[PDB]
Amino acid sequence: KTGCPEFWKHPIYKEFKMSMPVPERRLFEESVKFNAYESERWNTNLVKIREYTKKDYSEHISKSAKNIFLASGFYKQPNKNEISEGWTLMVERVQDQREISKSLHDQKPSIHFIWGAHNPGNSNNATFKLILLSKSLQSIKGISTYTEAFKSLGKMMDIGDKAIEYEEFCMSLKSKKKLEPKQINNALVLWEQQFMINNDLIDKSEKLKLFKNFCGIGKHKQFKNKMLEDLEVSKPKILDFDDANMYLASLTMMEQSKKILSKSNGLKPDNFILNEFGSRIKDANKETYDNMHKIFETGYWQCISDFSTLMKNILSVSQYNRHNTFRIAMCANNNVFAIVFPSADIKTKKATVVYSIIVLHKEEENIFNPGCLHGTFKCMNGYISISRAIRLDKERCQRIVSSPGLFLTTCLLFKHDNPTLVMSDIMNFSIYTSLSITKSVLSLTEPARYMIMNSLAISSNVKDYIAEKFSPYTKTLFSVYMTRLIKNACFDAYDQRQRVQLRDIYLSDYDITQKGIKDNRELTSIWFPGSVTLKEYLTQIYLPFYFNAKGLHEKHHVMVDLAKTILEIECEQRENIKEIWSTNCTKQTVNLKILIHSLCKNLLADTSRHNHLRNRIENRNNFRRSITTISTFTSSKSCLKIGDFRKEKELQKMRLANPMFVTDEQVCLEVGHCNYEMLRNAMPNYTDYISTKVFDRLYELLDKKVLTDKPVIEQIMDMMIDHKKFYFTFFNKGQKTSKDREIFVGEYEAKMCMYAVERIAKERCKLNPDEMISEPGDGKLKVLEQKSEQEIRFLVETTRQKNREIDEAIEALALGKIEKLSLGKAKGLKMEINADMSKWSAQDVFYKYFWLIALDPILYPQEKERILYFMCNYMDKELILPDELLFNLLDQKVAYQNDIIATMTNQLNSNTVLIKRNWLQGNFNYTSSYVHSCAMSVYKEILKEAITLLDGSILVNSLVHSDDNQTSITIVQDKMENDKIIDFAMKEFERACLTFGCQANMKKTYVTNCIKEFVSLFNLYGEPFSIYGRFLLTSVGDCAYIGPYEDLASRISSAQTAIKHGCPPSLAWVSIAISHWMTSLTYNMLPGQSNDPIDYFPAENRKDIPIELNGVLDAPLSMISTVGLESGNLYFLIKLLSKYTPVMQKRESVVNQIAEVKNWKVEDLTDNEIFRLKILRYLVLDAEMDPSDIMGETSDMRGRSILTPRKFTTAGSLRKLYSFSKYQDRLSSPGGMVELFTYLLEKPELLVTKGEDMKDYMESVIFRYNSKRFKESLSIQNPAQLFIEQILFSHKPVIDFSGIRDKEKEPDILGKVTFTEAYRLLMRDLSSLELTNDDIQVIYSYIILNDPMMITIANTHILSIYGSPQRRMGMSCSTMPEFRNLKLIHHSPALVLRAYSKNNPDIQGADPTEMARDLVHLKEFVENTNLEEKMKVRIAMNEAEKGQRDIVFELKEMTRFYQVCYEYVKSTEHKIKVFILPAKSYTTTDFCSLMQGNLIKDKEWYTVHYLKQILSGGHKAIMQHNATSEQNIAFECFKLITHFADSFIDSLSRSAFLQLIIDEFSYKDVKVSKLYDIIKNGYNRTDFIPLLFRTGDLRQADLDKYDAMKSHERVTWNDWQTSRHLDMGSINLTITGYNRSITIIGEDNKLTYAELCLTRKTPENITISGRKLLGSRHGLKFENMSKIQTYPGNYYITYRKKDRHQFVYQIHSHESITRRNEEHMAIIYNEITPVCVVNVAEVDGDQRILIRSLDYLNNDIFSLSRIKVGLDEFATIKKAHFSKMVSFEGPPIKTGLLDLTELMKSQDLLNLNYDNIRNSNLISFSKLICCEGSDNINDGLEFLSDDPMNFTEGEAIHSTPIFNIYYSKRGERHMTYRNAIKLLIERETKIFEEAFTFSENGFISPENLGCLEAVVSLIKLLKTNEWSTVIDKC
RNA sequence: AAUGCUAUAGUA
RNA sequence: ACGAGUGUCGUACCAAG
RNA sequence: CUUGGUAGUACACUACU
Ligand SMILES: *O[C@H]1[C@@H](O)[C@H](n2cnc3c(=O)[nH]c(N)nc32)O[C@@H]1COP(=O)(O)OP(=O)(O)OP(=O)(O)OC[C@H]1O[C@@H](n2c[n+](C)c3c(=O)[nH]c(N)nc32)[C@H](O)[C@@H]1O
């Protein structure tokens, strides 16, 4: 109701006003106070300002466009010289910044491990290996620094000959601190392979030098005795990458590694991956299986597996190391050992592990040495070599542990489908990259993407990027090798750009069959020798960025780096940036007039698009609803609190360690690390802050009554003026890039205001086509493809139009004439700009958002005032430096020279820095996107004006994201060379970006002819493309470590996403197998391990155990990609159907097969199936095993996992929360919890929700603290600690198994059962439950029939017939055709149960009369599953046995009810996003067919034929059925049947066929006769006049309306045009009106003549008749540049030009045309071009249709969809696509040998191209053959049509991307369907006869007859597999 | 081909 | 030694002789 | 240096999809 008058007095607003010119100030002040309603019109203020600024906008546009002539095509083109100069500058800069070392002894280990081949002779017993190690160590020869220490250690761990004593002592210790060592001869044993130091066997000097220098244990000065000294200032030291000697050494090291590791192990390769998924991998691809087996046979795999296993052992043995005890770790290899030197307990804070590898090799030079060796020593038998000491943390140890999966994935990705790549090189590169855990390779993997991409681009500034940004960090030799590889790739990229060639594009005006880049291995590989395709080249470029490990950054240094960056930007802005508005494109300035004009135009368009925008914003963002309902306001994310939190931080004397802050007393005190107390006391102006969860902060605000129960938008508005100071902290994202980014965190107050403003911006941004932030996920990939397709079109027809007459003259010519005519023609140009913006938020002008807010017409003046006040306050926000950063800074003792942090903090006087110009990253995404889209619109306008100056053609599409820009530009012109156009476009892109306060990152921006690069997505030439390998790498890489099932679920979801992006089937199976193997390793579940569940369940192998119970996945790959994580149960049920169902019903529909599940006997079921069905029924449907103690869990926290291990619980984090104290004190109350429990029992709505009101939300959040799942969710848990806990404590109880329904020094993650006794408990409880036929009926009824999607997928697996292979030429994106017909529940499961709890379907946020259907479905589930009756019985029996009601038990039961209801409703929700398929689907049948075809064989994709109506939506068809629904269904049915009848059937037999269809067929599960009755009774009978004539002869009423609706001008098309946009078909057109009728006859680009049968001959009626006739929706563009020579007299059609391409068509005389054109010749020249000639005659107005006449006129023709309604007028039926023809159902139609029902069911033979059928395969034609005793094939083909068909024609498009287009033409007489079938039969039968001969004599030879008899018998005996039928048929 | 107001692991 | 770094860090901590 | 005691995650992790 009230504004904020204090806004006009804000200093920020005053500066903004003074910066502006005087009239603009008045305009802004008027716009702020302008209101929509009280004004006469809503679009009056925007119009005023737009008119005011139009002059300046137009002058700027014209001046920018005029630069086209001043552009000389010397654009920034990369070449060899640019790369060389940039490399020299980079070398100089790197030398200046970092110290360069030329000595090889300065290298860091490339891989922190050394390996040698195993010894077959020596056994694998631990004691024998230990004795051998001791003897080898004691036998070292020679002299060195540490040889004495190593000999002494060998003496210490030597056990002599008392092997039996050692074994029995170790067993005794393992049978069960201050462990006492027994003197085993010379050893001092405390445990298995652990030895205490022996001062008697070693010199003290040797021990000190080993533990101080070699290992670094205690070598430092403890940071207290290190005062003002030993602090060495030095630059980072790296090797010389460009040095010839260093590169030679690196190459030698790589060669040695290749030489040794290539040798085979010499053993049979067997492992989990093989034994589980080998068959599936081999079926998907044999080459992938061969490559994987060869990998398993090599020494690389054994090396990496040994390293992983040894590291897993090292981490396990490091828990209880003493100060003077060193342990020994072993592995599978009997020659590789590690010594774990004493260190801290590794599960503590930032604890590291110290180890040194020992390798025993018979010969020297037999040791894989990746720069980690310390020395090889000769000893007894062979040599012994020991590596340098290695210290690593937990995250690096994790990566090293999860190495083999990454190695295998990388090797299989690089090698896949490439025979010219040597596998050893790939495996060498992969083993060196995957084992990298250092920043060196991480500093090269990311920049290489940009370097090679900009080198390959048409134009780029790669020289600058190399000179300034590229900075290799070469501390290892492999880093030098990779740097040389990158340099060579950058050199080669330019030379091989021309080696990319486009594929032959196929056009149909509705779809593009073929597109993309040609598949020729011409490009040179990057990381290793060989040749690669463009897709493989891009994969090699982009994949290595995902090799990087996450969390390799160290907090001590990265926090300082981020603070330095932010403060440097801030100080540069403070000291150099003063002006705001600039017209010279100054940096960090905005042009005012242009910005205002563009904003006004875009706002006008957006508001004009939708009338109701304010409401759209209010409703979609819960503006009118309470704050508790909004999700982001109730999340568990972090939030900032500013106040007095001294006590909390203090809970967790010494000197401050900083000379500046030391007082007199502080001098005489010990130095110590800064904590909160010393920081607070010393630092005068320190603001105190803490971080608490968002929901906890909201609860605290509700307690203090800051926020009430008023609608959120009202609450946000009052706080915009109630909050005046903003504080923001920051932390490090921990990303995997070279430089980590900073993440800004703000308080709850700022959060809500930013939420409101950005929702306002977002709802407007969703109304524009440019911004891609609005779409979710891979929706962008679909858009990119659509834009590419439309540009490709526009280019094709524009180039054809501009050069059609030139090409015609060239054809008529056929040397010198060809040259000049080719010179004088338009040139097609396609340019793609892949642009990024540098420092999108840091160096961004924030004053344009003021104008954006002020010009918004959907806001009241008070709202504008409050939002502007909020923005002004935001400009005064202060960044709070984190306490850890202050601790680092205050612990220096040496003053940094250019200390920017101290400079900006008043010498660390305060921890707040006033950040003004920088709006923090991630806060203003949508406003920035809108402004960037406005800038792109300005750029588009400039480009259009410039192209108009050249009189060319333009098409600009600018994809917009937050800071990622994709601008694609298509130009057709003939005035100047293309290079000048490219230079002009790039310069104006710079100018347009600068005019709006942005700047394009040319240092990372590049331009290509074909490649589209939007955000992480590719579109080569309209073919969607993506690097799917990143999903596999991420799945194999970072893990949550939360639990065995959810880990596997995340891995399988990543595999599913990769499949969606085009992963070949074999690599997906490899990824799934690797995921299962890694999950088994993490929890010790391999065959024979501790937690192997195969012996605890009635299952033959792991394939028969559900994933939830730690089984392996068994499902078809196409089925997994469709749903995922429910495929196991679905496949199990499908297998049960395939087995038990009777033979009669097996190839029936899945519903029909389920219909006889009652006939099944429950007794004759195997144990495994009974167990799995009990699992399904009870656990999935009516949960009886609680996965945890479900005490405070809402109806949201149930997954599918049954055995969920407990996780960490952090006492400190909970004690931080303000609501946790309330929960504890309420729990401390004598009976407080019971009152809350019974209050919830009285209000069960709070279980599903979290409390719509204030008080109920308070109670719900208090109650949720009892769950111990929500408690452990708020806890701090890191993958590293969880991984080390899993690998350390495997026997600890971690699982809480309460059972069916219900029934000191404790660790943090203690549980109830030990993960193994849980199997026994689960099986025991399952034995109690019983199974009946009703239970099975419920399981099939719900998991399958409830969802149409499940019925459909099971239908796909039952009715599938695999067909002919064919190449993957053009890929396309199709999401899910007719989704709504497959969705059971409309709304989200949260809303459905929300409307179920409150017994009212009218809940806010949902749709009434749609909640009705959903609640009906839900209620149905509860009723048929007895979900309520069983709960009531249980409650009654519990109360009876107890004798009094139990609130807790009732709460548990009710929570379980809502929880299983939520799980059931969520199970019916499927989120299937965009897919990449070898074609684009038209129906669900086509989509499923494409999926199955693409997801079987990697090399080729097949075509599948669902035998019996796969969709089978019997219940769904009843749902969503309406009057118009049936009427639309009938229209499509009859269009399809008529067009099929006259397109494929012989004309003389078309009537009987139509009658047979209309009598005994059905469409969409609807009888056809009913549809015909609908057609006859419908009003629009005229649309099917030919059909009504051919059948039933219904007339006189349709005909009268047909000659009657000519009241408005009606247009008919006597013959359809073969190409509508390319202008290439026979055209016959007729337009009829009042006493007027014109008929147009022409072919392709030439119009022959036009007959005008006008009523009167006067030359005045002719013009009015012409304009009236040609002004109708004829659809003939009249763009036929076939201008006709003019003859005196007569009349010509001509088309004048009207702007916006609204050409006006008129009829004119010769003399009039000539006179007007000569008059207009006087000094844009618009000339009327006469096209076609007009014949004028006088005719009467008599009616032209009589029912009797039709039979005579139509006697000659026999066409069902077309009849001659007049002599030259044809009545026609609208066409429809033939993809819908599958929905037809009926008995086979027997036309001799041919069966027409299977023909019309066939999709490959329904094509209208003679060539596509003449060149088909027998397999496609086989399904048609139905012999019935026939021998002659010709008898059958007589029924096929003999009308001429289309044949493809090839043309060359003249454009800078050279490509050829292939389209259809009319053809000839001999090109008929029957001729094509005859040729196909002859060719394919000959080929089949020669293919299956395998006999000396021939095909019909008796021996071959017997062989074919054996083949058909094999099938007549073996069960019908996927491909048996086609062999028999052919 | 399509057309109903609520259409509801990743990116910087 | 190793990790990190053109920011001083980690390189276990405390008590006693 | 020698003999004893201690240590569960760098207690931190956002804004939009
Ligand atoms: O499913 C769509 C379309 O994809 C599919 N289809 C097109 N071509 C097909 C084919 O060759 N074989 C099969 N099996 N399916 C084919 O059928 C549906 C489109 O049918 P169609 O009837 O061709 O679509 P129209 O746009 O022509 O529909 P209509 O409502 O008649 O459009 C009127 C609108 O377009 C002008 N018009 C009509 N016709 C026939 C032409 C023409 O031949 N050339 C030009 N230049 N314009 C035409 C009407 O005058 C008006 O402007």
Ligand SMILES: [Mg+2]
């Ligand atoms: Mg980009």
Ligand SMILES: [Zn+2]
């Ligand atoms: Zn036969």
